[PDB]
Amino acid sequence: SNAMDHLHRKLRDHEAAMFQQGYLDDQFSQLQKLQDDTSPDFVIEVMTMFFDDSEKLLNNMSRALEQVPVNFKQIDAHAHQQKGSSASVGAARVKNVCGTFRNFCEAQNLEGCVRCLQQLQQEYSLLKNNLKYLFKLQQEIKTAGRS
């Protein structure tokens, strides 16, 4: 069988690396679990929804930080929303960066908030690029199957 072929090995290795390095946590595993009416595209469908919401949110946060004066209460609300969205998909490193904003928002510290946003954007991009690779490999395996 092809169970041990290069695509299968790469997929298992890459996903395991994502967990070991903290990109993903068990909520992602919950999305991926075998079910009797959903397939693997379920996780892809969910993640596309998450990516679209997250990119809008991050753009809103960026713009917010450029306003004079800065509305720290809004920044904090955005960070909280992104935290829960990240938790819904098992994006562990992204979620944990989101939790760093509150402290700076309550202090009205803008340079802290900027640092937090830079980390958030970095972490989001790392997650998205690594997940896109996961999904590329899954798709290639599906193609090999057919059928």
- Domain ranges for the chain, please list them: 1-147
C-alpha separations of 85 from 78, 110, 146 in Å: 11, 24, 34
Cβ burial, residue 23 (10 Å; 0-12/13-18/19+)? buried
Q: What share of the chain is helix, strand, coil (3-state, %, to 5)?
A: 80, 0, 20
Q: Experimental method used, please?
A: X-ray
Cβ burial, residue 99 (10 Å; 0-12/13-18/19+)? middle
Give 121's contacts (C-beta < 8 A, 6+ positions apart): 58, 62
Q: Which two tokens stand for residue 119?
A: 């980390």
1-147 CATH pick, 1.20.120.160, 3.90.650.10, 3.40.50.620, 3.10.20.30:
1.20.120.160
Reported resolution, Å: 0.9
